[PDB]
Amino acid sequence: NEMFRIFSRFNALFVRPHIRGAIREYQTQLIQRVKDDIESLHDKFKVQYPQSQACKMSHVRDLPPVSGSIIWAKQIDRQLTAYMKRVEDVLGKGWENHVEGQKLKQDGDSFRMKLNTQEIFDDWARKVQQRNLGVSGRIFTIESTRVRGRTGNVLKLKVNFLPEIITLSKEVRNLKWLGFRVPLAIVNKAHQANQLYPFAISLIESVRTYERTCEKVEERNTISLLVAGLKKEVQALIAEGIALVWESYKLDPYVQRLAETVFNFQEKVDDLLIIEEKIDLEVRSLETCMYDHKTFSEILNRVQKAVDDLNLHSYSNLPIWVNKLDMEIERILGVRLQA
Amino acid sequence: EEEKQQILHSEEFLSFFDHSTRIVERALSEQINIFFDYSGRDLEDKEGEIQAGAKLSLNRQFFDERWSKHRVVSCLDWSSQYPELLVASYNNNEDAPHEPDGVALVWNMKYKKTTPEYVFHCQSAVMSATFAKFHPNLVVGGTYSGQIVLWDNRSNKRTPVQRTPLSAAAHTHPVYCVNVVGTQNAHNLISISTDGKICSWSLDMLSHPQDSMELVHKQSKAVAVTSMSFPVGDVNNFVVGSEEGSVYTACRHGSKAGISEMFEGHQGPITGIHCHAAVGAVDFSHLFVTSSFDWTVKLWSTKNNKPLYSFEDNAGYVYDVMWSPTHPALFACVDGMGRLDLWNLNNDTEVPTASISVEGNPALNRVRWTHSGREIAVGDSEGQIVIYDVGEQIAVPRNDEWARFGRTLAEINANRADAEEEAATRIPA
Amino acid sequence: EEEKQQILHSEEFLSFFDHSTRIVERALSLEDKEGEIQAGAKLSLNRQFFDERWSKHRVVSCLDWSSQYPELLVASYNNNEDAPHEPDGVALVWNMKYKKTTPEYVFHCQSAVMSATFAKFHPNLVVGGTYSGQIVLWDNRSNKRTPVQRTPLSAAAHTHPVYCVNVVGTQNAHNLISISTDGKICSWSLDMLSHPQDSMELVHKQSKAVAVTSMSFPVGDVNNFVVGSEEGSVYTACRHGSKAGISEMFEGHQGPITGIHCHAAVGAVDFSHLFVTSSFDWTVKLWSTKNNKPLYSFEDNAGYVYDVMWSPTHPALFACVDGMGRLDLWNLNNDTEVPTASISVEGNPALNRVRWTHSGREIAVGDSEGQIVIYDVGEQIAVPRNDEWARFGRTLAEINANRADAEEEAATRIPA
């Protein structure tokens, strides 16, 4: 770098009657610097691209792995070629005439041999051809399997998708950016996958929301009848989606309806959880309250306000829930009355 | 027992306990001993060696451990309304897969507390992290899944208060970075996806953006938005970086909405594009800074199709860089080696003016100075955000430094024209 | 205070205080609504105090902020036009901080009160004068709205209607100065009010005395003041001495002195020579001690300007008001021709006096109808930096040079 800066400063003295003398005086220093640069480039190449720390940083950049390794190799090759071109411009054409220039030419040939990337491109193409994928034709690919502790098929219904589609899309983008040949039929398949990707994301979100609703039901089994209407609506929507086919053109409207239903189910589950916590706290408090007429009236009024709010909440099976709450209040009042 | 356990678990009492612990921090950090010395005589050694890099000195490493398990700084932006702290967008909790993929910490500047004054938990990994200047009780962050959500810093819920829905018209692709755009009059927090959708949203409706469009240019070719840049005030005008490696100037408003111009000077994917971060008397809106993984920190002009000048000091894929907020000459730089290489254009052009090499390749991902630029913040692979203080060895901008920087820019244009003429003459016959 | 000192001046107590103080010192060492600094903090007309028992059928006479406590407004009312049975004239007060419309002491006056101002030398009282030949003192201590004491309406005191008065001298040695329409310069003893402590029949220009319609004194220069004239002969009034009186008949207008204050802005550049003046001929000019002629002028509005009293920090701003119902605050460092902060009141009603606060934090405005409107004057224009004060002084010197150059250009370019 210092020699390059000195050469840049002295470039204004090319016509002056000291350029050849300076070149003769600094030929040995330039050859030594070129050998040092070639050694540094060889050391950088010996830094393994497949497990590079810079490769980890690039993965942190979120680029595809193989494409990123190819990009790092291309950047290293670009740096080496730029250094060689700068040296050739500084020392004139036919730089291999000197012994240092011939050694630099040999090192550059070794680097060019060691920095192909065509082998990486061929390996990526061979892996893609071996894969040969295509999914999402069916909407709810029911991946029902015997869960740990439950031999019943745990239906992980979803579109026929995985992170491999995202890897293919990233690989296609990287190949387009870097200029490579590839299995253009696989490219068309990747284009279709990129088209269908937002719908797949919506389907995965719907699966997550349905799982959250199931978890909410498992928690508040004490209120599981109260959100029965939302559960039935979600079941009907899920049945419609399972009847749908992911290759169908109606996949977008079906996903929109499923998203609306999932949002409704989530909001209802949250509101029901809050209300049920309030009701259970009120019931325990009315059971344990101080045995006074005003205290009983206050607890009953709180329960009644909660009941009116729940009735406004538009839950399912409101009469059944009212009957259960009345029976519980009867048991609590009975314990109090006996005491 | 039961009463104490109920009181601690009670919501109002737990919130009061959290506020009291915040006060405990604000006292414990502010409680110096009795016979402390402040005569300033002990600074003879500090000022004696300050003649070799007063402009660079680490202040405090406001890292953590419950949220920094192999989770590098996904973003950095110093706060404005309460500038006494900074953010630390940890990467995915890969080393702690039990934890959620997004745990956003807050680095400290006012207090010597390793823990933060808030938290923004995220189900997925936080891609970008923005601190809202116009809203003082929250922050802005985007999931690596692609959800741009908000978790308040003044409330009691590190989880997303409102997440961007995974709508097909929304950013299904990963939301690479967002900017806290829009003033109080018309707030439109813009976004950029992996597909690159310019979700010029509205302040409230986190599920219905005000404006959304997947952007494309160069014969409708979709461009992955590597970063978002624009002039300060130019609502329509914007700049962007490309994964395929082609910076394209963007129009937001107008019938030509999208990347209108395309000034391509790099040789690969664009790392970071900060605009003219310090404009004095001159108007530097016709040029900006640029960073790329092609081992060369570029400077491309909004007017010049090819880039203006190239600082190719990087021996490998660089990480991130930005111009100084105060000095137009100074421009912070950072690569994978952790080489803090802030260069002052009017002062030291060829070599980086401030070379601060942290050994072991501290894995910088974003290097952002303070809003006032007192200390430059950058974080390694772990997340140890080292705030190297921008001391007056480079921090001081001259009175004529705006005019001198404009003259240096004109000289750079003249030298570039001379180099173009020399290259034209070098064409043989 | 002896016991307090002995508790303080104990050696053990002093050492313990030193150790505790050093230890404690070492240990403990909306926005959009706030975004109206350069667009509203210099002019925020907020406090509309108008007591309908007094404001209606009455005008504003003068105003001031109390030096003992600037949280109030010591201002009077003019002649109540349509109150033949009711009180002739009184003084209202609207507290700046406290939201109380009623004056703390409505000193109703039998005659028509000319003008008034508070006084921190004996801060329990207020002082003023009448439009018929009286000067009276009233105190917030007493419970009578009438005058606590009256100056003797005789040949000793200001026989003609004296429209200006000020308590000359601080709490160190106060002697309430009075200047009459008959030119009776009267420094009156603020304690013994039977006769004024000074009785000087002021006159100028070979004893042909002028109508001193606007008294003003430099800040702290108790030996020399400045008096306006109906005939315009504003001659520098020496205040202390045997030959004290209006000496240098500087003529910087073409009409009666509307309202003039000493341009006593404080900073790096001491502009004590300059004094802001306002004319009856719509001629707002900058007369000065050295500049016998008006140094620079301003003649924007057609109607006569009401009064001029610039703030005491920035020499750039010339606080005044237009006769057609608009404010007038021109910042010299900002512009020299156009009035900079020419805020417009509602309804374009005229006023006869206005004043910035004693701290300069707010510049209130009077009304012909009596609606006292107070406009906040923040730091956008009133915050004078020492450089900014020096910059304004240098701009004033450059403007003086430019005025001399323009006079030379007119003298050598007049076709004769």
Add this chain to the structure above:
Amino acid sequence: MAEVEETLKRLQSQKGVQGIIVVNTEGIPIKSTMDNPTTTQYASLMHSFILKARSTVRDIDPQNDLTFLRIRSKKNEIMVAPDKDYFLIVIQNPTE
């Protein structure tokens, strides 16, 4: 609960801390980390000091920062933080 407990353990994570106790006026602490008889006795003592400080504040100004009042004495920087529902009394150090 665990949030407040973790906050207490973080504020008392400083080495050599005498004791950080979430406390109460009832003579027992909400969450202390000392000897149980000493903790209850100091909780009662801090309750007495808290009542006296509350009366002192109401005598001086009845709308002050009446949620915490430390005692940064040389022995223990006794950071009393009486909350509205619970209370805290952190006998802490003069360093951090």
Add this chain to the structure above:
Amino acid sequence: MAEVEETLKRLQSQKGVQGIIVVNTEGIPIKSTMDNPTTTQYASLMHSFILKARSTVRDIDPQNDLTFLRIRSKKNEIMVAPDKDYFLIVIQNPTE
């Protein structure tokens, strides 16, 4: 000689210092250059609080030496210490 006045200036013009009183051991401030009643009332309140702190200390161990009582209030959070020989007032905000 000038040490007492220097201490008063130090603890009255510190980082946000409310004001310093070189008061006697009676609690009430000595040098009050305004309406003294507020100073005497606040200082009696602080003396009662300091006696409460001494009572709590003696509940723990009476042989503890105190540096200051870090009272936190919205009027003037006093890091002061009423003593049996005098009373040195230092009311300042540690964050300010």
